[PDB]
Amino acid sequence: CSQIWQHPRFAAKKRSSMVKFHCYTNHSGALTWFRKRGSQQPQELVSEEGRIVQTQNGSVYTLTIQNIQYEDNGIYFCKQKCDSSCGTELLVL
């Protein structure tokens, strides 16, 4: 990873299960999660009525994806929320 570290780097989960990813950096500023499918443009994650939740646990930013399904396949990464690259791959089994 670069200036932003993510854990895990790979997760494989059966449909309907839950996953939690974590990211942090040594700089100040909130991080926000994005999802990338293939080489497409990254898109900011939306809550989907609480199915996908971003929280902050001190210095660590956590993404929780519940009831995992096909649309969740992809590469997840954190970026500085407001800004004056490693990722986490999710494979749905």
Ligand SMILES: N[C@@H](CCC(=O)N[C@@H](CS)C(=O)NCC(=O)O)C(=O)O
């Ligand atoms: N409370 C706002 C956050 C606003 C904010 O911090 N905006 C940043 C950009 S990410 C900024 O510097 N905006 C400059 C301005 O409003 O003049 C929200 O959740 O939308």
Ligand SMILES: [Mg+2]
């Ligand atoms: Mg990979």
